[PDB]
Design a protein around this ligand. Structure first.
Ligand SMILES: c1ccc2oncc2c1
Length: 175
């Protein structure tokens, strides 16, 4: 690794990670599963009614957005969503011990997974959680690759899986 390469891990954190996985959109769009989304992976609603999505948006941002937000607003919402995922792990009796056992990079992948799937979805992954706690990284990654989460939308999940396998930021290099 060059001096620059060794600097790369210091540039990566959960925010940069999810920013790559989720992208950044300032207008309401449908995600790979067809759910109305905005900003940096902010799921507005699962309802197919755009009017519901717009309603959720105005509630979340606090003004009349008519389906459009600013970069600064996207980032505020993103920060709130990241905090919610972290809080969701730490208060959960199943997830916290696993999260605690992980190194810093895999902890980012954990927060990412929960940001994407929610707490009950992740906590239901009984085998993966045991594998991670036991540092069975290859097995954990293979099992994650069986999931609907990954298989229905591979591009959004592939880097997270690789990160659980390696505990490095390599999947986020060379975009
Ligand atoms: C919180 C703790 C451990 C985890 O493993 N995979 C996701 C996740 C979330």
């Amino acid at each position: 690794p060059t001096t620059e390469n060794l600097y790369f891990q210091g540039s990566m954190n959960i925010f940069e990670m999810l920013r790559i996985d989720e992208g950044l959109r300032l207008k309401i769009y449908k995600d790979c599963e067809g759910y109305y989304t905005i900003g940096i992976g902010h799921l507005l609603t699962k309802s197919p009614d755009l009017n519901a999505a717009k309603s959720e948006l105005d509630k979340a941002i606090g003004r009349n957005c008519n389906g459009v937000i600013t970069k600064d607003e996207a980032e505020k919402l993103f920060n709130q969503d990241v905090d919610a995922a972290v809080r969701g792990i730490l208060r959960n009796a199943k997830l916290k011990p696993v999260y605690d056992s992980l190194d810093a990079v895999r902890r980012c992948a954990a927060i990412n997974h929960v940001f994407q799937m929610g707490v009950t979805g992740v906590a239901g992954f009984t085998n993966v959680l045991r594998m991670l706690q036991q540092k069975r990284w290859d097995e954990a990654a293979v099992n994650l690759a069986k999931s609907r989460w990954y298989n229905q939308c591979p591009d959004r999940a592939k880097r997270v899986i690789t990160t659980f396998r390696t505990g490095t930021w390599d999947a986020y290099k060379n975009l």
